[PDB]
Design a protein around this ligand. Structure first.
Ligand SMILES: CS(=O)(=O)c1ccc(-c2ccc3cc(O)ccc3c2Oc2ccc(OCCN3CCCCC3)cc2)cc1
Ligand SMILES: CS(=O)(=O)c1ccc(-c2ccc3cc(O)ccc3c2Oc2ccc(OCCN3CCCCC3)cc2)cc1
Lengths: 246, 246
Protein backbone atom coordinates (compact mmCIF):
# COMPACT_ATOMS: atom_id res chain seq x y z
CA UNK A 1 0.00 0.00 0.00
CA UNK A 2 1.08 3.58 -0.69
CA UNK A 3 0.23 4.73 2.82
CA UNK A 4 2.62 2.11 4.22
CA UNK A 5 5.65 3.24 2.20
CA UNK A 6 8.56 4.94 3.93
CA UNK A 7 10.03 8.24 2.74
CA UNK A 8 12.89 6.53 0.89
CA UNK A 9 10.46 4.03 -0.63
CA UNK A 10 8.24 6.86 -1.83
CA UNK A 11 11.22 8.62 -3.42
CA UNK A 12 12.44 5.46 -5.15
CA UNK A 13 8.90 4.75 -6.35
CA UNK A 14 8.60 8.25 -7.82
CA UNK A 15 12.07 8.32 -9.37
CA UNK A 16 11.46 4.92 -10.98
CA UNK A 17 8.11 6.07 -12.37
CA UNK A 18 9.68 8.97 -14.27
CA UNK A 19 8.69 9.17 -17.97
CA UNK A 20 11.21 9.44 -20.82
CA UNK A 21 12.32 12.66 -22.48
CA UNK A 22 10.81 12.77 -25.97
CA UNK A 23 12.09 14.45 -29.13
CA UNK A 24 10.28 16.93 -31.35
CA UNK A 25 9.12 15.33 -34.61
CA UNK A 26 10.56 17.24 -37.56
CA UNK A 27 13.09 16.76 -40.33
CA UNK A 28 16.43 18.07 -38.98
CA UNK A 29 17.62 18.54 -42.56
CA UNK A 30 15.03 21.11 -43.61
CA UNK A 31 14.49 24.88 -43.08
CA UNK A 32 13.23 25.52 -39.56
CA UNK A 33 11.16 28.62 -40.33
CA UNK A 34 9.13 26.17 -42.41
CA UNK A 35 7.82 24.09 -39.51
CA UNK A 36 4.82 25.27 -37.49
CA UNK A 37 5.95 26.15 -33.97
CA UNK A 38 2.52 25.39 -32.50
CA UNK A 39 2.36 22.28 -34.66
CA UNK A 40 5.63 21.01 -33.21
CA UNK A 41 4.62 21.70 -29.61
CA UNK A 42 1.16 20.20 -30.04
CA UNK A 43 2.62 16.98 -31.48
CA UNK A 44 5.12 16.77 -28.65
CA UNK A 45 2.43 17.37 -26.01
CA UNK A 46 0.14 14.71 -27.49
CA UNK A 47 2.91 12.09 -27.44
CA UNK A 48 3.96 13.01 -23.91
CA UNK A 49 0.40 12.57 -22.67
CA UNK A 50 0.56 8.86 -23.39
CA UNK A 51 3.63 8.51 -21.21
CA UNK A 52 2.10 10.75 -18.55
CA UNK A 53 -0.67 8.20 -18.05
CA UNK A 54 1.85 5.39 -17.49
CA UNK A 55 3.63 7.65 -15.04
CA UNK A 56 0.42 8.52 -13.17
CA UNK A 57 -0.37 4.81 -12.83
CA UNK A 58 2.96 4.37 -11.04
CA UNK A 59 2.44 7.19 -8.56
CA UNK A 60 1.70 5.43 -5.25
CA UNK A 61 -2.00 5.57 -4.43
CA UNK A 62 -3.20 6.71 -7.85
CA UNK A 63 -4.55 3.40 -9.14
CA UNK A 64 -6.35 2.87 -5.84
CA UNK A 65 -8.79 5.56 -7.03
CA UNK A 66 -11.82 4.99 -9.26
CA UNK A 67 -11.27 5.22 -13.02
CA UNK A 68 -13.54 8.26 -13.10
CA UNK A 69 -11.51 10.01 -10.39
CA UNK A 70 -8.20 9.13 -12.06
CA UNK A 71 -9.48 10.75 -15.26
CA UNK A 72 -10.67 13.83 -13.40
CA UNK A 73 -7.28 14.31 -11.75
CA UNK A 74 -5.39 14.04 -15.05
CA UNK A 75 -7.88 16.22 -16.95
CA UNK A 76 -7.29 19.00 -14.46
CA UNK A 77 -3.51 18.55 -14.07
CA UNK A 78 -2.13 17.51 -17.45
CA UNK A 79 -0.89 20.92 -18.58
CA UNK A 80 0.64 21.78 -15.19
CA UNK A 81 2.47 18.44 -15.35
CA UNK A 82 3.79 19.12 -18.86
CA UNK A 83 4.87 22.58 -17.67
CA UNK A 84 6.68 21.57 -14.51
CA UNK A 85 8.50 18.87 -16.51
CA UNK A 86 9.59 21.49 -19.08
CA UNK A 87 10.76 23.90 -16.39
CA UNK A 88 12.75 21.12 -14.74
CA UNK A 89 14.65 20.19 -17.89
CA UNK A 90 15.16 23.86 -18.80
CA UNK A 91 16.76 24.64 -15.43
CA UNK A 92 20.34 24.54 -16.75
CA UNK A 93 19.50 26.50 -19.88
CA UNK A 94 19.03 30.07 -18.65
CA UNK A 95 16.97 32.13 -21.04
CA UNK A 96 15.77 29.07 -22.93
CA UNK A 97 13.05 26.44 -22.74
CA UNK A 98 14.07 22.85 -23.46
CA UNK A 99 10.80 21.57 -24.88
CA UNK A 100 12.89 18.72 -26.31
CA UNK A 101 16.62 18.02 -26.64
CA UNK A 102 16.33 19.00 -30.31
CA UNK A 103 13.98 21.91 -29.67
CA UNK A 104 15.53 24.53 -27.39
CA UNK A 105 13.69 27.82 -27.79
CA UNK A 106 14.28 31.33 -26.47
CA UNK A 107 11.89 34.14 -25.59
CA UNK A 108 11.71 35.65 -29.08
CA UNK A 109 10.74 32.34 -30.68
CA UNK A 110 7.32 32.43 -29.05
CA UNK A 111 6.16 35.53 -30.87
CA UNK A 112 4.88 33.41 -33.78
CA UNK A 113 1.74 32.63 -31.74
CA UNK A 114 -0.66 34.79 -29.72
CA UNK A 115 -0.12 34.90 -25.97
CA UNK A 116 2.85 32.59 -26.32
CA UNK A 117 5.65 35.02 -25.47
CA UNK A 118 3.87 35.83 -22.20
CA UNK A 119 3.66 32.16 -21.25
CA UNK A 120 7.28 31.59 -22.29
CA UNK A 121 8.31 34.42 -19.96
CA UNK A 122 6.39 32.90 -17.06
CA UNK A 123 7.90 29.47 -17.73
CA UNK A 124 11.39 30.98 -17.93
CA UNK A 125 10.79 32.78 -14.63
CA UNK A 126 9.75 29.52 -12.96
CA UNK A 127 12.88 27.79 -14.25
CA UNK A 128 14.95 30.68 -12.87
CA UNK A 129 13.23 30.27 -9.50
CA UNK A 130 14.04 26.55 -9.39
CA UNK A 131 17.67 27.19 -10.39
CA UNK A 132 17.82 29.84 -7.73
CA UNK A 133 16.46 27.47 -5.08
CA UNK A 134 18.73 24.69 -6.31
CA UNK A 135 15.75 22.33 -6.70
CA UNK A 136 16.76 18.65 -6.47
CA UNK A 137 15.49 15.75 -8.58
CA UNK A 138 13.97 14.04 -5.54
CA UNK A 139 12.06 17.21 -4.66
CA UNK A 140 10.93 17.67 -8.26
CA UNK A 141 9.28 14.25 -8.48
CA UNK A 142 7.44 14.92 -5.21
CA UNK A 143 6.15 18.24 -6.57
CA UNK A 144 4.92 16.69 -9.81
CA UNK A 145 3.04 14.04 -7.84
CA UNK A 146 1.52 16.67 -5.56
CA UNK A 147 0.25 18.46 -8.67
CA UNK A 148 -1.38 15.29 -10.02
CA UNK A 149 -3.16 14.58 -6.74
CA UNK A 150 -4.07 18.12 -5.69
CA UNK A 151 -5.07 20.02 -8.82
CA UNK A 152 -8.44 18.37 -9.32
CA UNK A 153 -9.27 17.34 -5.75
CA UNK A 154 -11.27 20.49 -4.89
CA UNK A 155 -13.40 20.07 -8.02
CA UNK A 156 -14.87 16.63 -7.40
CA UNK A 157 -18.48 16.53 -8.56
CA UNK A 158 -19.91 13.88 -6.25
CA UNK A 159 -20.39 13.74 -2.48
CA UNK A 160 -21.28 10.05 -2.16
CA UNK A 161 -19.69 7.83 0.49
CA UNK A 162 -17.26 6.65 -2.16
CA UNK A 163 -16.27 10.20 -3.10
CA UNK A 164 -15.63 11.03 0.56
CA UNK A 165 -13.40 7.95 0.82
CA UNK A 166 -11.64 8.95 -2.40
CA UNK A 167 -10.88 12.46 -1.15
CA UNK A 168 -9.66 11.11 2.19
CA UNK A 169 -7.29 8.76 0.39
CA UNK A 170 -5.93 11.55 -1.80
CA UNK A 171 -5.28 13.75 1.24
CA UNK A 172 -3.54 10.92 3.10
CA UNK A 173 -1.25 10.30 0.11
CA UNK A 174 -0.53 14.02 -0.16
CA UNK A 175 0.40 14.00 3.54
CA UNK A 176 2.78 11.12 2.78
CA UNK A 177 4.48 13.18 0.08
CA UNK A 178 4.80 16.15 2.43
CA UNK A 179 6.52 13.84 4.94
CA UNK A 180 8.81 12.69 2.13
CA UNK A 181 9.75 16.26 1.17
CA UNK A 182 10.52 17.11 4.78
CA UNK A 183 12.56 13.90 5.06
CA UNK A 184 14.66 14.79 2.02
CA UNK A 185 15.34 18.25 3.45
CA UNK A 186 16.26 16.80 6.85
CA UNK A 187 18.69 14.45 5.12
CA UNK A 188 20.21 17.37 3.20
CA UNK A 189 21.18 19.16 6.40
CA UNK A 190 18.50 21.82 6.61
CA UNK A 191 17.41 22.91 10.07
CA UNK A 192 13.77 22.51 11.09
CA UNK A 193 13.07 26.17 10.35
CA UNK A 194 14.78 25.86 6.97
CA UNK A 195 12.69 22.75 6.33
CA UNK A 196 9.28 24.38 6.71
CA UNK A 197 10.45 27.52 4.91
CA UNK A 198 11.65 25.52 1.90
CA UNK A 199 8.49 23.41 1.89
CA UNK A 200 6.38 26.56 1.76
CA UNK A 201 8.55 28.15 -0.94
CA UNK A 202 8.17 25.05 -3.15
CA UNK A 203 4.42 24.72 -2.67
CA UNK A 204 3.83 28.41 -3.36
CA UNK A 205 5.46 27.94 -6.76
CA UNK A 206 2.65 25.47 -7.52
CA UNK A 207 0.21 28.42 -7.50
CA UNK A 208 2.20 30.06 -10.29
CA UNK A 209 2.18 26.78 -12.23
CA UNK A 210 -1.61 26.65 -11.81
CA UNK A 211 -1.76 30.22 -13.13
CA UNK A 212 0.38 29.37 -16.15
CA UNK A 213 -1.80 26.37 -16.94
CA UNK A 214 -4.96 28.50 -16.73
CA UNK A 215 -3.54 31.12 -19.07
CA UNK A 216 -2.33 28.43 -21.47
CA UNK A 217 -5.74 26.77 -21.51
CA UNK A 218 -7.35 30.13 -22.32
CA UNK A 219 -5.41 30.35 -25.57
CA UNK A 220 -5.57 26.62 -26.38
CA UNK A 221 -9.37 26.76 -26.07
CA UNK A 222 -9.64 29.69 -28.48
CA UNK A 223 -7.36 27.59 -30.66
CA UNK A 224 -8.60 24.02 -30.25
CA UNK A 225 -11.85 23.69 -32.18
CA UNK A 226 -11.25 20.28 -33.74
CA UNK A 227 -14.82 19.27 -32.90
CA UNK A 228 -13.70 15.75 -32.00
CA UNK A 229 -13.49 13.43 -28.98
CA UNK A 230 -13.48 15.35 -25.65
CA UNK A 231 -10.31 15.08 -23.58
CA UNK A 232 -12.15 13.23 -20.79
CA UNK A 233 -13.11 10.41 -23.16
CA UNK A 234 -9.60 10.29 -24.60
CA UNK A 235 -8.09 10.07 -21.11
CA UNK A 236 -10.60 7.39 -20.15
CA UNK A 237 -9.78 5.21 -23.17
CA UNK A 238 -6.09 5.41 -22.29
CA UNK A 239 -6.58 4.87 -18.56
CA UNK A 240 -9.21 2.12 -18.87
CA UNK A 241 -6.82 -0.53 -20.18
CA UNK A 242 -7.26 -4.34 -20.04
CA UNK A 243 -4.75 -6.64 -18.42
CA UNK A 244 -4.35 -8.86 -21.49
CA UNK A 245 -0.77 -7.61 -21.87
CA UNK A 246 0.02 -8.29 -18.21
CA UNK B 1 11.09 46.32 10.85
CA UNK B 2 8.90 43.44 9.68
CA UNK B 3 11.80 41.00 9.59
CA UNK B 4 12.45 41.70 13.27
CA UNK B 5 8.93 40.89 14.45
CA UNK B 6 8.27 37.76 16.50
CA UNK B 7 5.56 35.24 15.62
CA UNK B 8 3.11 36.69 18.14
CA UNK B 9 3.92 40.22 16.96
CA UNK B 10 3.27 39.19 13.37
CA UNK B 11 -0.09 37.67 14.33
CA UNK B 12 -1.16 40.74 16.33
CA UNK B 13 -0.05 42.98 13.46
CA UNK B 14 -2.12 40.98 10.97
CA UNK B 15 -5.19 40.65 13.20
CA UNK B 16 -5.13 44.41 13.88
CA UNK B 17 -4.84 45.17 10.17
CA UNK B 18 -8.05 43.31 9.34
CA UNK B 19 -10.55 45.30 7.21
CA UNK B 20 -14.22 45.76 8.15
CA UNK B 21 -17.10 43.65 6.87
CA UNK B 22 -19.13 45.77 4.45
CA UNK B 23 -22.82 45.62 3.58
CA UNK B 24 -24.40 45.28 0.15
CA UNK B 25 -25.91 48.56 -1.05
CA UNK B 26 -29.59 48.06 -1.84
CA UNK B 27 -32.99 49.07 -0.50
CA UNK B 28 -34.05 46.33 1.96
CA UNK B 29 -37.66 47.39 1.49
CA UNK B 30 -37.92 46.61 -2.22
CA UNK B 31 -38.36 43.46 -4.37
CA UNK B 32 -35.08 41.55 -4.54
CA UNK B 33 -35.55 40.05 -8.00
CA UNK B 34 -35.42 43.69 -9.08
CA UNK B 35 -31.79 44.32 -8.12
CA UNK B 36 -28.97 43.25 -10.44
CA UNK B 37 -27.01 40.43 -8.81
CA UNK B 38 -23.83 41.34 -10.67
CA UNK B 39 -24.53 44.99 -9.96
CA UNK B 40 -24.69 44.31 -6.23
CA UNK B 41 -21.50 42.24 -6.19
CA UNK B 42 -19.59 44.72 -8.34
CA UNK B 43 -20.52 47.61 -6.04
CA UNK B 44 -19.51 45.60 -3.00
CA UNK B 45 -16.18 44.59 -4.57
CA UNK B 46 -15.36 48.18 -5.54
CA UNK B 47 -15.98 49.45 -2.01
CA UNK B 48 -13.98 46.61 -0.46
CA UNK B 49 -11.01 47.42 -2.67
CA UNK B 50 -10.55 50.74 -0.91
CA UNK B 51 -10.30 49.00 2.44
CA UNK B 52 -8.05 46.31 0.97
CA UNK B 53 -5.45 48.96 0.21
CA UNK B 54 -5.46 50.19 3.82
CA UNK B 55 -5.12 46.59 4.91
CA UNK B 56 -2.21 45.91 2.54
CA UNK B 57 -0.41 48.99 3.88
CA UNK B 58 -0.59 47.44 7.35
CA UNK B 59 0.82 44.06 6.34
CA UNK B 60 4.37 44.05 7.74
CA UNK B 61 6.91 44.63 4.98
CA UNK B 62 4.47 45.79 2.32
CA UNK B 63 5.15 49.54 2.47
CA UNK B 64 8.88 48.85 2.40
CA UNK B 65 8.39 48.00 -1.29
CA UNK B 66 8.35 50.50 -4.17
CA UNK B 67 5.00 52.04 -5.08
CA UNK B 68 5.20 50.31 -8.46
CA UNK B 69 5.77 46.91 -6.82
CA UNK B 70 2.98 47.46 -4.29
CA UNK B 71 0.60 48.14 -7.18
CA UNK B 72 1.79 45.07 -9.07
CA UNK B 73 1.19 42.83 -6.05
CA UNK B 74 -2.35 44.14 -5.51
CA UNK B 75 -3.23 44.09 -9.22
CA UNK B 76 -2.38 40.40 -9.32
CA UNK B 77 -3.91 39.43 -5.95
CA UNK B 78 -7.01 41.56 -5.44
CA UNK B 79 -9.58 38.98 -6.54
CA UNK B 80 -7.94 36.12 -4.63
CA UNK B 81 -8.01 38.36 -1.54
CA UNK B 82 -11.71 39.17 -1.99
CA UNK B 83 -12.37 35.45 -2.47
CA UNK B 84 -10.48 34.13 0.52
CA UNK B 85 -12.21 36.77 2.67
CA UNK B 86 -15.62 35.61 1.37
CA UNK B 87 -14.81 31.96 1.98
CA UNK B 88 -13.70 32.78 5.52
CA UNK B 89 -16.92 34.55 6.47
CA UNK B 90 -19.01 31.87 4.72
CA UNK B 91 -17.39 29.07 6.72
CA UNK B 92 -20.28 28.73 9.19
CA UNK B 93 -22.93 28.97 6.50
CA UNK B 94 -22.79 25.60 4.74
CA UNK B 95 -24.24 25.76 1.26
CA UNK B 96 -24.20 29.55 1.22
CA UNK B 97 -21.84 32.41 0.43
CA UNK B 98 -21.86 35.37 2.81
CA UNK B 99 -20.90 38.11 0.37
CA UNK B 100 -22.27 40.50 3.00
CA UNK B 101 -24.28 40.11 6.23
CA UNK B 102 -27.34 41.25 4.28
CA UNK B 103 -26.49 39.28 1.15
CA UNK B 104 -26.27 35.54 1.83
CA UNK B 105 -26.62 33.63 -1.43
CA UNK B 106 -26.94 29.94 -2.28
CA UNK B 107 -25.84 27.95 -5.31
CA UNK B 108 -28.98 28.53 -7.37
CA UNK B 109 -28.76 32.31 -7.01
CA UNK B 110 -25.70 32.46 -9.25
CA UNK B 111 -27.48 31.21 -12.34
CA UNK B 112 -28.50 34.77 -13.26
CA UNK B 113 -24.99 35.32 -14.69
CA UNK B 114 -22.79 33.28 -17.02
CA UNK B 115 -20.10 31.14 -15.41
CA UNK B 116 -21.24 32.30 -11.99
CA UNK B 117 -22.75 29.06 -10.70
CA UNK B 118 -19.45 27.30 -11.44
CA UNK B 119 -17.48 29.85 -9.45
CA UNK B 120 -20.02 29.74 -6.61
CA UNK B 121 -19.55 25.97 -6.45
CA UNK B 122 -15.78 26.32 -6.25
CA UNK B 123 -16.07 28.98 -3.55
CA UNK B 124 -18.50 26.81 -1.59
CA UNK B 125 -16.10 23.87 -1.88
CA UNK B 126 -13.24 25.99 -0.51
CA UNK B 127 -15.39 27.09 2.43
CA UNK B 128 -16.23 23.43 3.09
CA UNK B 129 -12.52 22.59 3.04
CA UNK B 130 -11.73 25.30 5.59
CA UNK B 131 -14.62 24.20 7.83
CA UNK B 132 -13.37 20.66 7.50
CA UNK B 133 -9.83 21.66 8.48
CA UNK B 134 -11.16 23.84 11.29
CA UNK B 135 -9.20 26.85 9.97
CA UNK B 136 -8.44 29.41 12.70
CA UNK B 137 -8.59 33.20 12.45
CA UNK B 138 -4.85 33.52 13.10
CA UNK B 139 -4.11 31.08 10.28
CA UNK B 140 -6.53 32.86 7.94
CA UNK B 141 -4.82 36.24 8.28
CA UNK B 142 -1.45 34.61 7.55
CA UNK B 143 -2.86 32.99 4.40
CA UNK B 144 -4.34 36.25 3.13
CA UNK B 145 -0.99 37.97 3.61
CA UNK B 146 0.83 35.15 1.84
CA UNK B 147 -1.53 35.65 -1.11
CA UNK B 148 -0.80 39.38 -1.26
CA UNK B 149 2.95 38.85 -1.24
CA UNK B 150 3.21 35.73 -3.40
CA UNK B 151 0.66 36.07 -6.19
CA UNK B 152 2.51 38.67 -8.22
CA UNK B 153 6.10 37.96 -7.18
CA UNK B 154 6.88 35.58 -10.07
CA UNK B 155 5.62 38.14 -12.60
CA UNK B 156 7.92 41.05 -11.84
CA UNK B 157 8.90 42.80 -15.05
CA UNK B 158 12.30 44.22 -14.10
CA UNK B 159 15.60 42.59 -13.17
CA UNK B 160 17.42 45.68 -11.91
CA UNK B 161 19.38 45.67 -8.65
CA UNK B 162 16.36 47.23 -7.00
CA UNK B 163 14.02 44.52 -8.30
CA UNK B 164 16.35 41.82 -6.99
CA UNK B 165 16.33 43.50 -3.58
CA UNK B 166 12.54 43.79 -3.74
CA UNK B 167 12.09 40.09 -4.48
CA UNK B 168 14.52 39.13 -1.73
CA UNK B 169 12.57 41.23 0.75
CA UNK B 170 9.26 39.66 -0.29
CA UNK B 171 10.69 36.14 0.13
CA UNK B 172 12.11 36.99 3.56
CA UNK B 173 8.72 38.30 4.70
CA UNK B 174 7.01 35.20 3.32
CA UNK B 175 9.49 33.07 5.30
CA UNK B 176 8.51 35.07 8.40
CA UNK B 177 4.85 34.26 7.82
CA UNK B 178 5.66 30.57 7.36
CA UNK B 179 7.46 30.66 10.73
CA UNK B 180 4.37 32.31 12.20
CA UNK B 181 2.03 29.62 10.84
CA UNK B 182 4.26 26.89 12.23
CA UNK B 183 4.40 28.73 15.56
CA UNK B 184 0.60 28.90 15.78
CA UNK B 185 0.34 25.18 15.06
CA UNK B 186 3.02 24.36 17.65
CA UNK B 187 1.08 26.41 20.19
CA UNK B 188 -2.13 24.54 19.31
CA UNK B 189 -0.62 21.20 20.24
CA UNK B 190 0.14 19.74 16.83
CA UNK B 191 3.15 17.44 16.56
CA UNK B 192 5.98 18.36 14.19
CA UNK B 193 4.64 15.97 11.54
CA UNK B 194 1.15 17.41 11.95
CA UNK B 195 2.67 20.88 11.64
CA UNK B 196 4.26 20.40 8.22
CA UNK B 197 1.26 18.41 6.98
CA UNK B 198 -1.17 21.18 7.94
CA UNK B 199 1.12 23.84 6.48
CA UNK B 200 1.16 21.99 3.16
CA UNK B 201 -2.60 21.41 3.20
CA UNK B 202 -3.24 25.15 3.72
CA UNK B 203 -0.79 26.31 1.06
CA UNK B 204 -2.16 23.84 -1.49
CA UNK B 205 -5.58 25.44 -1.09
CA UNK B 206 -3.97 28.67 -2.34
CA UNK B 207 -3.58 27.01 -5.76
CA UNK B 208 -7.34 26.48 -5.93
CA UNK B 209 -7.89 30.12 -4.93
CA UNK B 210 -5.54 31.16 -7.75
CA UNK B 211 -7.59 28.98 -10.11
CA UNK B 212 -10.86 30.53 -8.97
CA UNK B 213 -9.44 34.02 -9.47
CA UNK B 214 -8.27 33.14 -12.99
CA UNK B 215 -11.68 31.77 -13.95
CA UNK B 216 -13.41 34.78 -12.42
CA UNK B 217 -11.16 37.18 -14.32
CA UNK B 218 -11.98 35.36 -17.57
CA UNK B 219 -15.65 36.23 -17.21
CA UNK B 220 -15.09 39.70 -15.73
CA UNK B 221 -12.90 40.58 -18.73
CA UNK B 222 -15.57 39.50 -21.21
CA UNK B 223 -17.86 41.60 -19.06
CA UNK B 224 -15.81 44.67 -18.12
CA UNK B 225 -15.57 46.88 -21.19
CA UNK B 226 -16.10 50.26 -19.51
CA UNK B 227 -13.26 51.72 -21.57
CA UNK B 228 -12.06 53.79 -18.61
CA UNK B 229 -9.06 54.08 -16.27
CA UNK B 230 -6.98 50.85 -16.14
CA UNK B 231 -6.90 49.07 -12.78
CA UNK B 232 -3.16 49.72 -12.40
CA UNK B 233 -3.70 53.48 -12.52
CA UNK B 234 -6.65 53.24 -10.14
CA UNK B 235 -4.58 51.22 -7.67
CA UNK B 236 -1.70 53.66 -8.01
CA UNK B 237 -3.88 56.70 -7.26
CA UNK B 238 -5.16 54.98 -4.12
CA UNK B 239 -1.76 53.69 -3.00
CA UNK B 240 0.19 56.87 -3.82
CA UNK B 241 -1.30 58.96 -1.02
CA UNK B 242 0.18 62.10 0.59
CA UNK B 243 0.86 62.39 4.29
CA UNK B 244 -1.12 65.61 4.70
CA UNK B 245 -3.68 63.71 6.81
CA UNK B 246 -0.96 62.19 9.00
C1 LIG C 1 -1.15 29.06 -27.52
S1 LIG C 1 -0.20 29.09 -25.95
O1 LIG C 1 0.73 30.30 -26.01
O2 LIG C 1 -1.13 29.58 -24.82
C2 LIG C 1 0.77 27.74 -25.31
C3 LIG C 1 0.58 27.27 -23.98
C4 LIG C 1 1.36 26.20 -23.49
C5 LIG C 1 2.36 25.58 -24.32
C6 LIG C 1 3.19 24.45 -23.83
C7 LIG C 1 3.77 24.54 -22.52
C8 LIG C 1 4.56 23.49 -22.00
C9 LIG C 1 4.80 22.33 -22.77
C10 LIG C 1 5.60 21.29 -22.24
C11 LIG C 1 5.84 20.11 -23.01
O3 LIG C 1 6.59 19.12 -22.50
C12 LIG C 1 5.28 19.98 -24.31
C13 LIG C 1 4.48 21.01 -24.86
C14 LIG C 1 4.23 22.20 -24.09
C15 LIG C 1 3.42 23.25 -24.62
O4 LIG C 1 2.87 23.09 -25.93
C16 LIG C 1 1.50 22.62 -25.99
C17 LIG C 1 0.82 22.63 -27.23
C18 LIG C 1 -0.51 22.18 -27.34
C19 LIG C 1 -1.22 21.70 -26.17
O5 LIG C 1 -2.56 21.23 -26.19
C20 LIG C 1 -3.18 20.88 -27.44
C21 LIG C 1 -2.88 19.39 -27.73
N1 LIG C 1 -3.33 18.35 -26.80
C22 LIG C 1 -4.74 18.57 -26.40
C23 LIG C 1 -5.27 17.32 -25.67
C24 LIG C 1 -4.40 17.04 -24.42
C25 LIG C 1 -2.89 16.98 -24.76
C26 LIG C 1 -2.49 18.23 -25.58
C27 LIG C 1 -0.56 21.68 -24.92
C28 LIG C 1 0.78 22.13 -24.82
C29 LIG C 1 2.53 26.08 -25.66
C30 LIG C 1 1.75 27.15 -26.14
C1 LIG D 1 -19.04 36.97 -13.80
S1 LIG D 1 -18.29 35.87 -12.54
O1 LIG D 1 -19.19 34.64 -12.43
O2 LIG D 1 -17.06 35.18 -13.16
C2 LIG D 1 -17.88 36.35 -10.88
C3 LIG D 1 -16.58 36.12 -10.36
C4 LIG D 1 -16.27 36.50 -9.02
C5 LIG D 1 -17.27 37.12 -8.20
C6 LIG D 1 -16.97 37.53 -6.80
C7 LIG D 1 -16.25 36.63 -5.95
C8 LIG D 1 -15.93 36.98 -4.62
C9 LIG D 1 -16.32 38.23 -4.10
C10 LIG D 1 -16.00 38.57 -2.76
C11 LIG D 1 -16.39 39.84 -2.23
O3 LIG D 1 -16.07 40.16 -0.97
C12 LIG D 1 -17.10 40.77 -3.04
C13 LIG D 1 -17.43 40.45 -4.38
C14 LIG D 1 -17.04 39.18 -4.93
C15 LIG D 1 -17.36 38.84 -6.28
O4 LIG D 1 -18.07 39.79 -7.07
C16 LIG D 1 -17.26 40.61 -7.94
C17 LIG D 1 -17.90 41.43 -8.90
C18 LIG D 1 -17.15 42.25 -9.78
C19 LIG D 1 -15.71 42.27 -9.72
O5 LIG D 1 -14.88 43.06 -10.55
C20 LIG D 1 -15.45 44.17 -11.28
C21 LIG D 1 -15.39 45.43 -10.40
N1 LIG D 1 -14.10 45.94 -9.92
C22 LIG D 1 -13.12 45.98 -11.02
C23 LIG D 1 -11.88 46.79 -10.57
C24 LIG D 1 -11.25 46.13 -9.33
C25 LIG D 1 -12.29 45.89 -8.21
C26 LIG D 1 -13.53 45.16 -8.78
C27 LIG D 1 -15.05 41.45 -8.76
C28 LIG D 1 -15.80 40.64 -7.89
C29 LIG D 1 -18.58 37.33 -8.75
C30 LIG D 1 -18.88 36.95 -10.07
Amino acid sequence: LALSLTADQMVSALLDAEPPILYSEYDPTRPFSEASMMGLLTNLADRELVHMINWAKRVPGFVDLTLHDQVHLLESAWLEILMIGLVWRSMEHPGKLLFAPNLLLDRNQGKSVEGMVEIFDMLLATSSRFRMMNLQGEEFVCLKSIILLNSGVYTFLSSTLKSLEEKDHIHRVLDKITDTLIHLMAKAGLTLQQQHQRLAQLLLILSHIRHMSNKGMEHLYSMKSKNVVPLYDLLLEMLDAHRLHA
